Amino acid sequence: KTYSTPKRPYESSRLDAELKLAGEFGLKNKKEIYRISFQLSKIRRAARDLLTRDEKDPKRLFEGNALIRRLVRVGVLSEDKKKLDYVLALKVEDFLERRLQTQVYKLGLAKSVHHARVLITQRHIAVGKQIVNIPSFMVRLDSEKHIDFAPTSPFGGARPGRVARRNAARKAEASGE
Amino acid sequence: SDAVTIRTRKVISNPLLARKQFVVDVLHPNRANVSKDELREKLAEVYKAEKDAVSVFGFRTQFGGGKSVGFGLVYNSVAEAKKFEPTYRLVRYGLAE
RNA sequence: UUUGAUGAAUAACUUUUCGAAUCGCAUGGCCUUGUGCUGGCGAUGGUUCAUUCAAAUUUCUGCCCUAUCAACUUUCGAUGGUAGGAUAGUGGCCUACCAUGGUUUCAACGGGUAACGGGGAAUAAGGGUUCGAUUCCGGAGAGGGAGCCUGAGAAACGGCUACCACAUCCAAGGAAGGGCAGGCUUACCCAAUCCUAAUUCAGGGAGGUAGUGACAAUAAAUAACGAUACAGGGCCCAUUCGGGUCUUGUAAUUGGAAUGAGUACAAUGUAAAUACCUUAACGAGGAACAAUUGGAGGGCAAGUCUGGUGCCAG
RNA sequence: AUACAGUGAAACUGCGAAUGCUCAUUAAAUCAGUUAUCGUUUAUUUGAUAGUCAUGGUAUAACUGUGGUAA
C-alpha cells in the first residue's frame, strides 16, 4: 500500500477533522490526507523507538542527529528546536503546510488556495528551473524562497495566451471590418 | 537570439584512427531540437573540418527544455570517415544506400 | 687436504610414414643471349615435439532423519595376489590360476528424506530483519527393445539393418514417413553483446526491438477570478410550550483572463520503426469538450384498490 | 588475350554442422574444494623442427542424347 485506512475511518472526530483540513488546504481526498499521515506515523514511530533506546547509546546518538537534520532540511522542523521530543511533537498540518499549493497561496502569487491549485496544474508556477505541475510537491527551504512564475508564463513572462490573442485579433477584425 | 548551444562535453581525442570524441548536451532555449545536419556544418567550421567527417548522433532532450543528451564524434580524414563508419550511420548521414 | 672444473647405438621386424609433382610477387647478375643460369619477399600442407583448448580417470576434504535398521558382502570378484586380453591408459575393468576375505556399533548396513533439493555456487540486501538476482540441479529420452557406422571430441539417436507397434499414398504391382503448441500472437533486424565458418561482409526465430495483455498498486483534470442586480430572512440545539444567533439568500443578469484533453507540420529518435522527449498552428461557455455510484425524504389527480359506526383510515 | 586470367550457376574438395525440448531423484552418490597423471588423449592455437621429375597415370560430376515407371 501507499495509503492506509485509519482504523476507525468513520467517526465524529475523524470526519469533522478531515472536513476542516481539506477545506482549508484545498485538497480533494481523504486519500491525500492519508498519505501524509501514514508517512508521519512511520517517522514518529521511528523517533519513539529511538527514545526507548537509552541515553548515550551510539545508535541513538548518530541516528537522532540524522533524523533531526534531515527534517530541518525538509523544513517542517525549525532550526532552534533540535530535539527528538519535538520530532515527536509534529502533526499532519505541518506537512500539509509544506505542500506546494499552500505555499503558492501563502507567498502570495494567487488569492485563494483553489487559485493556486489551478495555477500549478495550469503550468505557470516554476520552482527553481522546471515547470512543476504537481500540487503536492513538498517544497524545501531553498526552493520555498525560490517559488515564482515560469518565464514562459503569460503572468510573469512571454506573450499573452491564446484567449487573449484571439480576442485582440477579434477586435482587430472589428476595427478592420 | 537563440544561444545555439550543444555542449560537446566529455572532450577526448584519438589520433590512432584520427578522430575526436565528445558527448552531447543541447542547450537551445526557445528552439526545438536543432538537427544534426546544420550541426554537422557548424561543427565543420568550428573544427576546420569536413562536412562528412563531422559525426554526432543519438540525441535525447532533457526536461525543462534547452537540454538534450546525445553522443558525438568527428573524423580527421575523409578516408577514415568514409571507411570506418558503419553503414547505418552512413545512411543516417545519407552517404550510403 | 681446498679454491674451481668433466662426464657419471647394434640386431633385425613392417601394406610404408616420409624427405611438397600446390598459390602471391623479385629482374637482376653473367654470357654459354640461351629467353641459359641464378636468385630474393608473401600463401596452402607435411615430420615430430612442446604449448594451448579440452577430455578421461584419481588423492584427499566436507551434506539430513533414524538401531521402531545388526548385520553386509562372495547368489557379475565379495578382498587380494599372479598372468593375459581389452582400453588412448592404470586397475578384478574382464578371464584363467589362486589365496579366503573385506565393512560394522567410532551403528556398517538399512529405512524414510516433501533430494523443485542444496551448494557464501551466485551478485548480494549502497539499511527488507535474512531478502533479492544469477549459476550447478543429477540423469535419461527424442515410436519401442537390439546392433552398426564417421569425426579431435558423439555410443550423434532429425544415418543404416532387422524387429515390434503405429499411421500414410496408389493404377493393388509398390512406396514413404515420425510429435509440438492451445483450451477445458508466432510482426522487423544481425544494429548493442557474443559466436562460427575457406572468415571484415556470409550467418547466428543465439542476441536484440516492437505489437495484443483496466486487474494489485501511483499522479493529475472535469474549472479559477471579478462586477452588478433583486430579495429579508437565514442557521444551530431542545421531548411540547420553546430557546440561541447573525451577512444572507437566488436555475437573476453580466465582464475579461487562464488553459489541457484534444486537433495537428516538423525535429529528436532506431538496423529500420512505434510510442516517447521537444515543437510551431488550431483548440471551453453550457442542450460544452455532457462523471458515476449509493442513501434519506416529501408532495400531486374530476386516477385506481381495500376496510370501516358519515367528510375518515389503509 | 590465338591458353586462360573479369564474373559466375551446377559439381569436386577442405572444415563446421558434438555451443533442441520433454520425462525420472541419488545423502562419499552427486556437488564444492583439493590433488595426481615417472600412467593417458588431443582437430585447433602459437613455438621449434626433415640433404639421407622442362613434371607419371588417372577419373568424375556436370553436359549431350536415349529411356523406363502412377512414383
UniProtKB/Swiss-Prot annotation, chain A:
Higher taxonomy: Eukaryota, Fungi, Dikarya, Ascomycota, Saccharomycotina
Name of the protein in its database record: Small ribosomal subunit protein uS4A
UniProt keyword rRNA processing present: yes
Protein species of origin: Saccharomyces cerevisiae (strain ATCC 204508 / S288c)
Gene name of this polypeptide: RPS9A
Remarks, miscellaneous: Present with 106000 molecules/cell in log phase SD medium.
Record flagged with keyword Lyase: no
S4 RNA-binding domain span: 98-172
Single Gene Ontology BP annotation: ribosomal small subunit biogenesis
Quaternary organization: Component of the small ribosomal subunit (SSU). Mature yeast ribosomes consist of a small (40S) and a large (60S) subunit. The 40S small subunit contains 1 molecule of ribosomal RNA (18S rRNA) and 33 different proteins (encoded by 57 genes). The large 60S subunit contains 3 rRNA molecules (25S, 5.8S and 5S rRNA) and 46 different proteins (encoded by 81 genes). Interacts with snoRNA U3. uS11 interacts with MPP10. Component of the ribosomal small subunit (SSU) processome composed of at least 40 protein subunits and snoRNA U3.
Sites bearing Phosphoserine, chain numbering: 175
GO CC, one annotated term: nucleolus
Matches recorded under PANTHER family: 30S 40S RIBOSOMAL PROTEIN, 40S RIBOSOMAL PROTEIN S9
NCBIfam families on file: PRK04051.1, uS4_arch
Curated annotation (Swiss-Prot), chain B:
Superkingdom: Eukaryota
GO biological process: cytoplasmic translation; maturation of SSU-rRNA from tricistronic rRNA transcript (SSU-rRNA, 5.8S rRNA, LSU-rRNA)
Post-translational note: N-terminally acetylated by acetyltransferase NatA. Also partially acetylated by NatC.
Originating organism: Saccharomyces cerevisiae (strain ATCC 204508 / S288c)
Phylogenetic placement of the source organism: Eukaryota, Fungi, Dikarya, Ascomycota, Saccharomycotina
Keywords: Acetylation, Cytoplasm, Isopeptide bond, Phosphoprotein, Ribonucleoprotein, Ribosomal protein, Ubl conjugation
GO cellular component: cytosol; cytosolic small ribosomal subunit; mitochondrion
Gene it is expressed from: RPS24A
Parent-protein residues present: 2 to 98 of 135
Protein name: Small ribosomal subunit protein eS24A
Modified residues (N-acetylserine): 1
